[PDB]
Amino acid sequence: SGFRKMAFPSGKVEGCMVQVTCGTTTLNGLWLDDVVYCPRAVICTSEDMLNPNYEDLLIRKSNHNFLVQAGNVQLRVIGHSMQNCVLKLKVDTANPKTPKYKFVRIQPGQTFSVLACYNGSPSGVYQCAMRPNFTIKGSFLNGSAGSVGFNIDYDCVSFCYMHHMELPTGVHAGTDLEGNFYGPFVDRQTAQAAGTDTTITVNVLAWLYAAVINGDRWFLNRFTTTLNDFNLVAMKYNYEPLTQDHVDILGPLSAQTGIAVLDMCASLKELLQNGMNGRTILGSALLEDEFTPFDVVRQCSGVTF
Amino acid sequence: SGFRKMAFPSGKVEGCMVQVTCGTTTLNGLWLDDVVYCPRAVICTSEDMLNPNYEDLLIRKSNHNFLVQAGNVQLRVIGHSMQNCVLKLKVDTANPKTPKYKFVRIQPGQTFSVLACYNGSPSGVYQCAMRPNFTIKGSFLNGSAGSVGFNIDYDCVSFCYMHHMELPTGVHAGTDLEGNFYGPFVDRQTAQAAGTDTTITVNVLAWLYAAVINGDRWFLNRFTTTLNDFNLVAMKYNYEPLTQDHVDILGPLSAQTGIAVLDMCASLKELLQNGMNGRTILGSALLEDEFTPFDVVRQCSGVTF
């Protein structure tokens, strides 16, 4: 019993984190096989980040200008290339600790674990979600760039995020491992506003199912609703519209609890319109939306890796 | 910027988790050097756990009755002993992945990371605290026994908790790595009630400092108070009494923020008496008490390991 924001075990990724230094700038990189992946902002000074021409800045860089250090293991760069907003540094040694891995571009609403690193060294691990505005609400200080977000399925690490920047709002933006930013953000220190932070409706419902499974039953009501009627309420409270695909994804949890999805939607509607009246759900006084339906099953079934 | 419930990187502990099977019962063990540590309930059936005489049950057990498996690495038990509520199984092979480690008995209010495991295999990592009633509010299913809680200081893993049981209340109880339970709990399936769940005052204050550092400033008021006046309020709301030792531990955060501890106490007093009026602090609608002063410094300074 009990329900917590649980991250994946980080060992498989810890063994891939390295330090990448170019001139005066140091950030983190990801060493998989004989390639190190890092943000291209490693080649920039602070003055450059105001308005950088990365292709011109990279001309003045050679293999020997990139210092890569795995703990004390000093890796030799034998090739370098820019892919979108990431640099790919070919090294002479394949990482012996390379896990089974994949690069995946995730969708808003999906969750992942972040291993926050500084100077190539891990500091902590936590679970985040890709917000509908394509930001993430993480914990990153200067030097965190190159930290990665990931999911694990038994032995395969699916890398989905590389951290790049912090917006003036205090939220965070980054890329997939192919270098493409999530959302409209660019790797430049300019005016970049996030967008409406909408609540991931399917995840709130999954978390409500997790609550029922763990004994929290006070929010269950006598009402039901329709998808269209609920979505009128969702719009008012800046909730993502619920689709039939979402209903389908919640089917397994509906089956285990015996609570129809549309009945849970009606309970959520009453919560949005009346509040929690000072009560709590799974130790929270607000509606949580960074648990996917898969996350709930995982934690309530005890899947291991 | 940003503040999250951050766990330590779990790699160093993942390499120590093994599966321990005795008869029909399987749980997790911790393989450090040539000893495997596990709950003594591994020798019990379900019927035994009603009222077990562990010393008598262990008489009918020999080295060959304990099957220890590290992934597929099958370890040979060459000796066994009971220490309080843990079994120490001497094996023929020292764990090559043994980290620098220590066994520590923590105090209520202190935090640690849990690596939840099943069948010797990791499932997830999360941060918990030893509650003042000597329970922990974790996420544990059947088979989780033997999962461990720990802290890391650069290269030294300090093991402080081994999971044993779940109380009918849904809270969790366990031992240190010497086998002594935290609190009055026993490894028997009997009537065991927890105790008053008091809020860790020094941790709430640390989290308020973390909020100010990260931009949350609305709760700062024009008042101050005294330790005795505040503690009158703390008692009413089942908060732990604040001591001068606690004030001293918060000194570094007071210095960085410029907010005197007693001024933050006055802001907390107003929050306890008036609520948050639907506002949030660091994304929470309740007062968080599972961040220590050390945890806040760690996350706001970027300490690595």
From Swiss-Prot, chains A, B:
Active site per UniProt: A41 (for 3cl-pro activity), A145 (nucleophile)
Covered residues, full protein: 3264 to 3568 of 7096
Annotated control of activity: Inhibited by pyridone-containing alpha-ketoamides compounds 13a and 13b. In turn, alpha-ketoamide 13b (tert-butyl (1-((S)-1-(((S)-4-(benzylamino)-3,4-dioxo-1-((S)-2-oxopyrrolidin-3-yl)butan-2-yl)amino)-3-cyclopropyl-1-oxopropan-2-yl)-2-oxo-1,2-dihydropyridin-3-yl)carbamate) inhibits SARS-CoV-2 replication in human lung cells. Inhibited ex vivo by michael acceptor inhibitor N3. Inhibited ex vivo by compound 11a and 11b.
Ranges in the topological domain labelled Cytoplasmic: 1-305
Catalytic activity: TSAVLQ-|-SGFRK-NH2 and SGVTFQ-|-GKFKK the two peptides corresponding to the two self-cleavage sites of the SARS 3C-like proteinase are the two most reactive peptide substrates. The enzyme exhibits a strong preference for substrates containing Gln at P1 position and Leu at P2 position
Task of the protein: Cleaves the C-terminus of replicase polyprotein at 11 sites. Recognizes substrates containing the core sequence [ILMVF]-Q-|-[SGACN]. Cleaves and inactivates human TRMT1, preventing tRNA guanine(26)-dimethylation of tRNAs. May cleave human NLRP1 in lung epithelial cells, thereby activating the NLRP1 inflammasome pathway. May cleave human GSDMD, triggering alternative GSDME-mediated epithelial cell death upon activation of the NLRP1 inflammasome, which may enhance the release interleukins 1B, 6, 16 and 18. Also able to bind an ADP-ribose-1''-phosphate (ADRP).
UniProt superkingdom: Viruses
Domain Peptidase C30 residues, every copy: 1-305
Crosslinked residue numbers (Glycyl lysine isopeptide (Lys-Gly) (interchain with G-Cter in ubiquitin)): K5, K90
Protein name in the entry: 3C-like proteinase nsp5
Subunit record text: 3CL-PRO exists as monomer and homodimer. Only the homodimer shows catalytic activity. Interacts with host FBXO22; this interaction promotes the proteasomal degradation of nsp5.
Location(s) in or outside the cell: Host cytoplasm; Host Golgi apparatus; Host nucleus
Consequence the record notes for mutating P132H: In strain: Omicron/BA.1, Omicron/BA.2, Omicron/BA.2.12.1, Omicron/BA.2.75, Omicron/BA.4, Omicron/BA.5, Omicron/BQ.1.1, Omicron/XBB.1.5, Omicron/EG.5.1
